[PDB]
Amino acid sequence: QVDVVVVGAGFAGLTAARAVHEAGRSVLVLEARDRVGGRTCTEEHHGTWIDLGGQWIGPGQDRVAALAAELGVETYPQPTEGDDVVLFGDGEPQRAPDVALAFSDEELTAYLELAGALEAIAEKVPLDAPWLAPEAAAWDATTLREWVAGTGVPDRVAGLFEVAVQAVFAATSAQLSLLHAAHYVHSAGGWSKLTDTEGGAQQDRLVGGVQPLAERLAARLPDGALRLSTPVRGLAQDGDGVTVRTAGGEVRARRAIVAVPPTLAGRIDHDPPLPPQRDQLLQHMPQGSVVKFHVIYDEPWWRAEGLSGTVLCPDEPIGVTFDGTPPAGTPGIVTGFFEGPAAVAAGARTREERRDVVVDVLARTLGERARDVRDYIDRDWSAEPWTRGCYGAHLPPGAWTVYGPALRVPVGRVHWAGTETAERWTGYIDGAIESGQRAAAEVLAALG
Amino acid sequence: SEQVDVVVVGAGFAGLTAARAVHEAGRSVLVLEARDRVGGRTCTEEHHGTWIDLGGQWIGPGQDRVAALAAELGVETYPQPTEGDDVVLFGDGEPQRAPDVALAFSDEELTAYLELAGALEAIAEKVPLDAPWLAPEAAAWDATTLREWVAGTGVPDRVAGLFEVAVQAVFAATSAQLSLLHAAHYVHSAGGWSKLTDTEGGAQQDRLVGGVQPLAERLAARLPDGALRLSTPVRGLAQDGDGVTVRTAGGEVRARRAIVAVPPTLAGRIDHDPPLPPQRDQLLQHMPQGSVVKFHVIYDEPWWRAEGLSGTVLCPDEPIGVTFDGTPPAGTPGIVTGFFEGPAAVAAGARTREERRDVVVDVLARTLGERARDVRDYIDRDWSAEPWTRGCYGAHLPPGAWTVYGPALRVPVGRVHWAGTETAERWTGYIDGAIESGQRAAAEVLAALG
Ligand SMILES: *Cc1cc2c(cc1C)nc1c(=O)[nH]c(=O)nc-1n2C[C@H](O)[C@H](O)[C@H](O)COP(=O)(O)OP(=O)(O)OC[C@H]1O[C@@H](n2cnc3c(N)ncnc32)[C@H](O)[C@@H]1O
Ligand SMILES: *Cc1cc2c(cc1C)nc1c(=O)[nH]c(=O)nc-1n2C[C@H](O)[C@H](O)[C@H](O)COP(=O)(O)OP(=O)(O)OC[C@H]1O[C@@H](n2cnc3c(N)ncnc32)[C@H](O)[C@@H]1O
Ligand SMILES: [Mg+2]
Ligand SMILES: [Mg+2]
Ligand SMILES: [Mg+2]
């Protein structure tokens, strides 16, 4: 009987396991995949790292910053310089030193007042208990889209905001409760923290990619602690401990930490069954929809034309793009996303069809050289059986107030981690690390 | 390990309807059922010398499949009691008695209610029953909650309040949780707002003598010996070019095709190899089941009848929104049937049976009167706590789900086909729709074998 079994070797499960180990307790980590990292995933292509999952860290994300400094992983900055390209409907593409400058003064004022009003709501939502916001009932009964419509902003401001909503949540403003969106904004420290490159969540990348950071963290566990390719099928508990059922047999432990996405946590055969509020909470925490891609060129040819590699095209299937080129300055990479409904349409299509859509948008925005592609690499996170959607879960109207209170509460000897249980930077790597520290501290107090 | 033409997962009305159709067409069939019984979301226990329907209980006009099955298998109906005054208790003031609930409203309020139901029916008729995502305004209707749509109409507070009671009693969810497209499809599927909410002439018109689980048991008895396997949950469903391998705790069954006939949330928990396509997996994440605790309060006699009361109370501002006289034809024991719905169901499910009893008796004491404290017994079921349902009455879809994920609802995944009330075109969410879905999935499987 080990002291603690951890289900999942993402940043949450690995953080919890390392904290249990460092306190002197025995720990086993059971991971479904043949690798650690979960929603972070890095492959070597064209002599560099391709981050197919989470890739960016930014100011305010102190837990991931500290971990990367501890384990010796250096950062490099997201490129910021050169003209962004903005494309509206059937128009001609517009080059601007920033996205902002493609909108009128009145439009920019309406956008900043809309963001400001969402921040003023956010600041009233308690990070540990969104259901205890003074206006929780009203805010939980309203979609973000209904709230945006009630502000009277112009069409183009609503469309620009919607690009930002889809880029952050991997879901439309109609899918999200206003209470969910407000908690998320509060959790990150503001709308600028979510949407900015410099000063925001997209500021910095990790040299070598993110999955090798998770690997360095797993290398702090003793040999024998990690079991890969070992999906957890069942989790039983009684007065004396827990029993974990796998295809290849059973593990006995005193306590468990389940650190997987909510929809996957619900699919485990729990004995006794989870209490009904927690089962229905997981039914009400759907994962987002995102296809992430990297278009590979021999060189970042856009930079010589004075372009950043960032395109903003509210009427196209892809959202914002980014220059994904490593510090070596080759190969050239354009990074971007299909989000929400576009991700679901694109996921039903082949890699080749997705390639063709992306290359066509870039050809009409960055220029005709976009057609001279070396390679196109993508990942539909909704098709990953051990994730079933990126970036993370969202909550539709009525879920946070009625089912939300069951989010973190241990069920007997079973404790919960994962980015979706974080108070700060929920949905991000930094939040996953928070959640593992919290679950470890709970289990260590319970064993003692 | 055993080999058969068709394996059916689940012995609700959908799985049993399918299994019987496959059997009668001359194919070999196994039915694997997780529980030690058939019936699923229909469940009947014997208490106080009568039947207690803990699950589905009513059938009404326009439900032709369940009416035909009951007649075929010799199950008689009895009418839901209609007579006596209903009691309406609004957020303010004393309880009002009226020969019908509508008489509790002002003329302005009744007009507003009927115009709101009529405007919803007009939208509902434009929603194709086979493909709600092909409605001409699907994108707009799928982006709006039913609550937002109601707010836009400008009806008075008491009208929104009563409409909310009906919404929660029909969907086991609040108007905020539901897309307008979902609600509208459901209304079209039933044949209108009256069909959903009426007793006489609607879905609550009739009961089955003996209760509903005996009907499911008579349907299971139409299968050959050895076809039904109770207490056999399905854990895994592996498929290849030639068949499907069904994994249970103790073994495996090999079939040519499978019909999975379980609630959407439980279908998604089965270990599929290859994994389900992403649109389908994400649709199941967007099909949460409702939240209801159903109760029967037992009295020696239906005492409210001697006071000229129907035993129906309507309370927009109480944890119990609606009740019915549940008394069997013999006239004893007296029964008051009712529901905790939505947020009230989740709050009540966290408390004990005795605590839920004391909430119900408090509402009934203030509406039916003092004799409501003279309880012989109290029987209830939290359908959210049932591991093989995880919420009644059925799934609903939040905003954005029908147009983006919805097209994957019925489409087979190789040799795995889908049944259940949630896949029905007509009377979706009812026993009638469970039966439709079983006939459809059997016809599909029989056409694809040859
Ligand atoms: C997918 C993605 C995520 C992402 C993003 C872009 C995409 C396409 N961009 C990000 C970014 O640039 N910066 C950032 O900070 N975050 C970004 N995100 C989100 C981020 O990747 C996630 O928040 C974070 O990685 C989540 O970590 P957590 O540890 O909470 O969850 P996980 O990585 O999903 O790990 C769960 C592990 O459990 C395994 N699994 C699942 N089920 C089982 C069972 N039954 N048995 C055993 N193991 C199981 C998974 O395989 C996984 O390893
Ligand atoms: C619960 C409920 C339902 C209900 C209602 C009141 C309540 C509290 N009132 C209704 C009414 O008065 N009239 C009516 O027509 N319907 C009413 N409803 C809804 C109705 O009960 C359902 O629509 C209908 O019964 C649904 O039937 P279906 O056949 O589609 O589904 P099921 O009954 O849930 O059966 C599924 C079976 O599958 C088994 N199961 C689940 N998972 C597994 C696995 N993994 N392996 C094997 N078997 C599985 C279940 O145990 C169940 O038997
Ligand atoms: Mg810039
Ligand atoms: Mg009447
Ligand atoms: Mg019609």
Side-chain angles (χ1 to χ4, degrees), chain A residues 304-393:
Chain A
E305 305 290 1
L307 297 167
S308 69
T310 280
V311 313
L312 163 68
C313 304
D315 303 312
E316 297 290 333
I318 66 171
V320 185
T321 63
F322 292 82
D323 186 329
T325 300
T330 67
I333 303 178
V334 182
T335 305
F337 311 86
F338 298 85
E339 304 284 13
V344 183
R349 298 180 90 202
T350 63
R351 189 197 63 100
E352 292 78 23
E353 286 172 314
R354 290 190 305 264
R355 171 193 69 202
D356 294 348
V357 164
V358 173
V359 166
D360 170 63
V361 174
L362 297 181
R364 292 190 276 111
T365 55
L366 291 185
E368 188 73 353
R369 195 179 301 183
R371 294 190 182 288
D372 190 20
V373 51
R374 187 67 167 201
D375 200 2
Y376 170 86
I377 303 171
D378 80 9
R379 183 128 318 155
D380 175 5
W381 283 90
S382 309
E384 288 286 314
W386 300 119
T387 306
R388 287 309 200 178
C390 266
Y391 314 119

Side-chain angles (χ1 to χ4, degrees), chain B residues 295-436:
Chain B
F295 61 81
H296 300 269
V297 193
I298 317 297
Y299 293 93
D300 287 340
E301 297 184 315
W303 53 263
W304 52 88
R305 288 178 183 188
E307 319 246 41
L309 292 169
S310 59
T312 287
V313 313
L314 208 88
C315 302
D317 202 19
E318 296 289 338
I320 306 311
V322 69
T323 69
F324 291 85
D325 187 337
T327 303
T332 64
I335 300 180
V336 179
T337 304
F339 309 84
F340 300 80
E341 303 281 11
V346 182
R351 299 188 80 199
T352 68
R353 183 192 66 92
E354 297 80 15
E355 293 176 328
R356 290 194 294 267
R357 173 199 66 210
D358 291 352
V359 169
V360 174
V361 170
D362 178 77
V363 172
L364 293 188
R366 282 181 290 123
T367 50
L368 295 184
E370 196 53 47
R371 255 180 282 166
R373 293 199 172 278
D374 305 343
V375 168
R376 163 71 54 190
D377 199 0
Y378 172 89
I379 305 167
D380 88 357
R381 181 137 308 158
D382 182 358
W383 281 92
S384 304
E386 286 282 313
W388 302 116
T389 309
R390 293 303 205 175
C392 266
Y393 308 124
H396 64 270
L397 281 82
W402 263 119
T403 54
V404 172
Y405 307 94
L409 179 64
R410 274 177 212 104
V411 174
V413 174
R415 291 170 171 283
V416 178
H417 303 246
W418 310 109
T421 194
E422 286 88 3
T423 66
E425 296 184 20
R426 286 146 180 279
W427 284 111
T428 193
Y430 294 76
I431 301 158
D432 194 76
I435 295 165
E436 184 196 302

Side-chain angles (χ1 to χ4, degrees), chain B residues 9-15 32-35 37-42 54-59 63 203 232-235 261-263 266 270 292 294 339 383 388-389 392-393 419-422 429-432 434 437:
Chain B
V9 185
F13 274 92
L32 310 185
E33 168 53 50
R35 291 188 165 105
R37 66 182 181 82
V38 306
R41 281 172 266 183
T42 75
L54 290 177
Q57 79 175 29
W58 282 296
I59 69 172
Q63 297 175 2
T232 309
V234 168
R235 287 186 171 177
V262 309
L266 292 171
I270 294 171
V292 54
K294 176 175 183 184
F339 309 84
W383 281 92
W388 302 116
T389 309
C392 266
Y393 308 124
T421 194
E422 286 88 3
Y430 294 76
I431 301 158
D432 194 76
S437 79

